[PDB]
Amino acid sequence: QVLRGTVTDFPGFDERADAETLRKAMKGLGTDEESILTLLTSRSNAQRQEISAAFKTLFGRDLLDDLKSELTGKFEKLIVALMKPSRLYDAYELKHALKGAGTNEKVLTEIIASRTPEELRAIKQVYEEEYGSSLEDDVVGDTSGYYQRMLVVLLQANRDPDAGIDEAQVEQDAQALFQAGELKWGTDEEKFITIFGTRSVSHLRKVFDKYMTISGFQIEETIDRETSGNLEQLLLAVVKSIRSIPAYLAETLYYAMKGAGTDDHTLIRVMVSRSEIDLFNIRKEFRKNFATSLYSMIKGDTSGDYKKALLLLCGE
Ligand SMILES: [Ca+2]
Ligand SMILES: [Ca+2]
Ligand SMILES: [Ca+2]
Ligand SMILES: [Ca+2]
């Protein structure tokens, strides 16, 4: 999914001095938001958890409850997201798209399609431990049809391991996709799901090329031509992630920031979930496509402390 994040372990880290630094920034009338945003933004997540622990043993206070009572809005929502242990952030985001009453499919899609099987295994485990219920049971209860089925397949976190290309198998899957969509009166979604959901990543990159070659269409155009609604978005997320997780996340960031507004929720989530994985690589793919740094888009799209914090996450 990887290569590099923007946030790194600060050197000569002292969670006791940091905890006092944060106590100071909140103690009394007012909040020193800048001292908060600068400290939390230059501490890796593991270090934020140590701070939180030091704070509680120093003052008998919950750091998270204090930040929430001192901060407000998006900047708040961003600090809260940043304090969330890495291990639980995606489970949280997933939990939260499944509740409140109405289901947020863009969040299921985004996360399930862009995380690896190894990340999904981890995610399934912590969601169960944290919410009791099974991620899988919760998706299915809130979704239906091929969209639900495609998510269930991905949730198995059982994609074939990369392994030297079987050209006969590449031609057969490309031909199968050709026959299931373009040559078919209607569509065979089941075939798309099986191939997208279980073939190895190196194998599907090859299938996508062979598919183009055979049909004169990119698989994304076919998806657009043959599917609609939630399934379409997902199939496109999966294909884009196969091709490049970074590129898909960069793209996700972009469309978050271009409307007559800003998707703060989305914006936070990708910047925070990927800061210690591949935000760096998302940076370069943002520039590469869209032509513009993420810094400026963000810089031009956001205000305040929020803006400062975001840019602090992003860099260069
Ligand atoms: Ca205060
Ligand atoms: Ca608040
Ligand atoms: Ca068709
Ligand atoms: Ca369409």
Curated annotation (Swiss-Prot):
The linked condition is: Pregnancy loss, recurrent, 3: A common complication of pregnancy, resulting in spontaneous abortion before the fetus has reached viability. The term includes all miscarriages from the time of conception until 24 weeks of gestation. Recurrent pregnancy loss is defined as 3 or more consecutive spontaneous abortions.
- One GO MF term attached to the UniProt entry: calcium ion binding
| Listed SMART domains | ANX
N6-succinyllysine: which positions carry it?
K288
Under the heading Pfam families, the entry gives: Annexin
Q: Which GO terms describe its biological process?
A: blood coagulation; negative regulation of apoptotic process; negative regulation of coagulation; signal transduction
Q: Mark the residues carrying the PTM N6-acetyllysine.
A: K68, K74, K77, K95, K99
Gene name of the encoded protein: ANXA5
Q: Where are the Annexin repeats?
A: 13-84, 85-156, 168-240, 244-315
Write out the entry's keywords from A to Z.
Acetylation, Annexin, Blood coagulation, Calcium, Calcium/phospholipid-binding, Hemostasis, Isopeptide bond, Phosphoprotein, Repeat, S-nitrosylation, Ubl conjugation
Post-translational modification, briefly?
Answer: S-nitrosylation is induced by interferon-gamma and oxidatively-modified low-densitity lipoprotein (LDL(ox)) possibly implicating the iNOS-S100A8/9 transnitrosylase complex.
Question: At which residues is the cross-link Glycyl lysine isopeptide (Lys-Gly) (interchain with G-Cter in SUMO1) found?
Answer: K27
Q: What is this protein called?
A: Annexin A5
